[model samples]
Target: KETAAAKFERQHMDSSTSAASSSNYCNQMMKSRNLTKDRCKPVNTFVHESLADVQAVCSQKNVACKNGQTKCYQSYSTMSITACRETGSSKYPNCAYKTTQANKHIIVACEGNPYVPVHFDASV
Candidate 1:
């Protein structure tokens, strides 16, 4: 079976252009023809601000973990979870946790920022 990745590779690979085009594309993406060990990337858009935002949210909220509950982590200053309202249906109704998991440096809807929706990635 052709997986998604295999299908993509098969569709994008061009047979006409010798090895030159492929090599050049790779080099451009790497930002250097030579993959040196000491090449350091400069500060980027993803600075500490994003992390701080997430931390701020966590600091303010009180995560009530109880009886071997799965701890959920959240980030503040982002739109992951403005606030958590428990459903009160779980085993630990009072301990229902709301955290910013699986969302990192994610762009959310800012009140008036035009580029409010930005990309974000998160992990457990």
Candidate 2:
């Protein structure tokens, strides 16, 4: 079984080299990442930073979680991230996304024994 921390990494972490800026980047990555299956994920984010750096955000709690169970923490420093937003006319099995690259502070909901991030909250 996968931990929440592991699932977060699978869906949101992109700590590899640098991501491609190509127009097709999201179109390809989103599918390969398993975000677009029976239904298209409306919005998704990819963070480009060390796993340790992203995990350290748990040290400080920032805001209430949108769904309200756990506290959400905002990253102390802005991180390199890409936001993928689904475009109009997209359908299942053929999801499309518009990618926007930016440096922004990420907010995430964390839990568990090691207090690792469980969900991608938002960026500011």
Candidate 3:
């Protein structure tokens, strides 16, 4: 079974590469990456920083999760990331996304024995 930590890596990690030049990066990636299986994920994010830096966020200041859980953390430094928002006309089998890149501090939920990032809460 794929753990939440592993799922997070699959959904959000993109360290080795920079943002794609084409606007279709999100549209292609969202589907190719399997985020549109059951339904279109309304919103998602992909971090463009090193995995080590992202993992280290766990040791940063603790923060409240979006759903009010206590397992979230706020990154100490702004990270390069791409935000993917589904288009209105997007259908299940043909998910489309608008890709926007930015540098922002992100909030993520963590879990597991060592407490690593398991979900992307938000970016600010």
Candidate 4:
């Protein structure tokens, strides 16, 4: 079953790093991580923290979600992350992206009895 938590993992988690040496991080990840599939995702993020560290957020700090959901939680600590924002020059089916890496606190919406991240909401 493709649970929300599972989809979240497929779409987000990049706990470890790859070479990223050529610096086409966005281009590579947006494709490698399946973001460029349906269409160019305008914006997306990948977290560089362990699954456990991320799940810990579910119990860290309860917060309001951007979508008016109360299940969102803020990470207790700032974490390493990378986001890809599609450039205007980007063409669907052949998308282009700009990568911005950051160290920030993340906010995510959690669900299920065991409490797991279902949606990555924001970072600041």
Candidate 5:
């Protein structure tokens, strides 16, 4: 079974995607990473930073979690990221996405014994 940390990495890490430009990048990834299920995930962001750097975000500026939880943190350094948004014509199992790359601070929700990131909340 995968741990929460491992799950986060699988769904959100993209260290080698710094130069990602393919229009189908998000379309492929969202499905490959299981973001597409009975319904399509409307939007998601993948961080192109090292796992250590991502973990270090726990020590960055504190912020509000999207769910109104208080365990979220915002990255101090701008990170290379790819935002995946579902295309209007997208449908379940045939879901498509618009991939956009940018450098921005990211917000993540953290928890557990070591207080590591558990969710990719948003990009700031």
Candidate 6:
């Protein structure tokens, strides 16, 4: 089955446009004010040339092993419950519950893809 990120990309994000499938989705989510990056981690991990081979593997598999709550799979990054916990609440609180964390994230972006999506484990 496709992750929420894939679902969102297939639904709204353009597949033929210049926007990177992952980055565009991530940025769009941020634009919607659905999520907030603690430090600058963007809470999104973009899939692009800049990513390492192993990272790409994770991207294609939509893996969020680093975190446990792999919830919404946006274009750029997968929403991990860990990320929510780190921020202090879920990005989509209206859709789910809230979590808390002491440290935030550091958003990283690629050149072609300005918006990076994060892939993590989450529930709800």
Best by lDDT: 3
Worst 10 residues of 3 by lDDT: 14-23
Error of 4 at 111 (Å): 0.3
CA lDDT, every model vs. true structure: 0.26, 0.87, 0.89, 0.86, 0.87, 0.30
lDDT: which is higher, 3 or 4? Answer: 3
Off by over 4 Å in 1: 1-49, 66-124
Q: What is the C-alpha lDDT profile of model 6 across 22-104, one tens digit per residue?
A: 32344344435334423323333222222232133233323233334442232243322122222334344222222221122
TM-score of 4: 0.92
Which tens-of-lDDT digit does each residue in 49-117 have in candidate 5? 888899999988998787887899999889999999998898887898999988899999888878898
Ranked candidates (lDDT, high to low): 3, 5, 2, 4, 6, 1
Candidate scoring better on TM-score of 1 and 6: 6
Candidate 4 lowest-lDDT run of ten: 15-24
RMSD of 3: 1.1
Query: Candidate 6, TM-score vs. the true structure?
Result: 0.21
Worst 10 residues of 1 by lDDT: 108-117
Order the numbered candidates by TM-score, best leading. Answer: 3, 4, 2, 5, 6, 1
Prediction-by-prediction clash tally = 7, 0, 0, 0, 0, 30
Local error of candidate 1 at 124, Å?
Answer: 16
> What residue runs in model 2 are displaced by over 4 Å at the alpha carbon?
none
Give the alpha carbon lDDT tens digit for every residue of 37-70 in model 4. 8988898888888999999999998999988879
The TM-score values for the models, in the order shown, are 0.19, 0.92, 0.94, 0.92, 0.91, 0.21
Give the worst 10-residue stretch by lDDT in candidate 2. Answer: 17-26
